[PDB]
Design brief:
2 copies of one chain form a homodimer. By secondary structure, chain A is of the alpha/beta class. In chain A, strand 2 and strand 3 form a beta hairpin. The first copy, chain A, has one domain: 3-Layer(aba) Sandwich (Rossmann fold). Chain A is built from 5 helices and 6 strands; from the N terminus they run βαββαβαβαβα. The first copy, chain A, is globular, with a radius of gyration of 14 Å. In chain A, strands 2-3-1-4-5-6 form a 6-stranded mixed beta sheet, sandwiched between helices. Helix content of chain A is about 35%, strand content about 25%. At the A-B interface, loops of A face helix 2 and helix 3 of B. The structure holds guanosine-5'-diphosphate (2 copies). The site of one guanosine-5'-diphosphate has 19 residues of chain B, from helix 1.
């Protein structure tokens, strides 16, 4: 079993907490408090890769916390909301921050969350894909609400990590 | 440069959480008044860069550990209070330190306050047990008196110095 630390980043309300709860606990409850209720949570994927997952919900404003959150992190997911263009712009700022401040070996994924609300889409799939490709990022659209692509994002990260 | 943070107070009922908050925020103490800060939260600052605290009291809510998600969400600091005249309160402070370490952001700054230190002629919690305990858990520690204001401002100052700039 390989075990790694993974951090979730992104604007408040994009779905960071929901994504971690869906992956770790299997479930979703709408309008819950925006937190994972735990200092960190753990879950695995079999190829076995075990993730210790740190959420930044409630802490998004505090970029000087970066040293602590990124120390010993092997992976990160930057999350945006596909219905909110500003959150995609914001995601780029965190991708940049990871690139400048996290370990040079960190595996970064971008998640376009709330893809169940594709009718209210404001960030084009092809736009985020090009951006992800330009930055050597993993990219998927996700829905914590339905579970669409949630486990599979963590699996894609697991495959990119060292053995 | 005003950094503003959220701070939560934990500890057994009657240790002095509400008194400590009112002393820092309003400057004053009134003995035997209701165990509440009379506000959803209160704000006060410390100048170093000015650090502003939005302070949540748990007085009246101590039983309900299931509220922790809401209280700890977006919190950057916490103070766990005990009463230096009451050993069970110190034993209890350890339970809340453990709850914060398990359930709050890993980045949270945690302080330990031995309150009612003005009643040193009724002391039952050894300062050295408390200090050793604080050291083992990477906590800030001071004894305080909401009643006289001894060390109350300086406790929040010490927390402010440890928080991110
Ligand atoms: N429709 C939809 N709502 C979601 C999704 N993920 C999260 N939410 C909701 O969006 C709000 C914010 O989610 P939350 O996980 O707390 O975001 P966080 O602040 O980034 O941790 C809550 O009401 C969630 O239930 C999703 O994939 N689809
Ligand atoms: N002697 C003394 N009494 C205090 C001190 N702090 C609080 N008290 C008193 O202890 C009682 C409980 O305090 P309170 O602040 O309501 O505790 P809380 O339930 O933790 O909010 C009240 O009668 C306070 O006036 C202190 O530093 N010294």
């Amino acid at each position: 079993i390989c075990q790694f630390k993974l951090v979730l980043l992104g604007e408040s309300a994009v779905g960071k907490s929901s994504l971690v709860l869906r992956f770790v606990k299997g479930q979703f409850h709408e309008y819950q408090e925006s937190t994972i209720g735990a200092a960190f949570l753990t879950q695995s994927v079999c190829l076995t890769v075990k993730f210790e997952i740190w959420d930044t919900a409630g802490q998004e404003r505090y970029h000087s916390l970066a040293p602590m959150y990124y120390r010993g992190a092997q992976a990160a997911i930057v999350v945006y909301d596909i219905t909110n263009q500003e959150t995609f712009a914001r995601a780029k700022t965190w991708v940049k921050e990871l690139q400048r401040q996290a370990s040079p070996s960190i595996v970064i994924a971008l998640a376009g969350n709330k893809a169940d609300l594709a009718n209210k889409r404001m960030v084009e799939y092809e736009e985020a894909q090009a951006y992800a490709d330009d930055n050597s990022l993993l990219f998927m659209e996700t829905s914590a609400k339905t579970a669409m692509n949630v486990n599979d994002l963590f699996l894609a990260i697991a495959k990119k990590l060292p053995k």
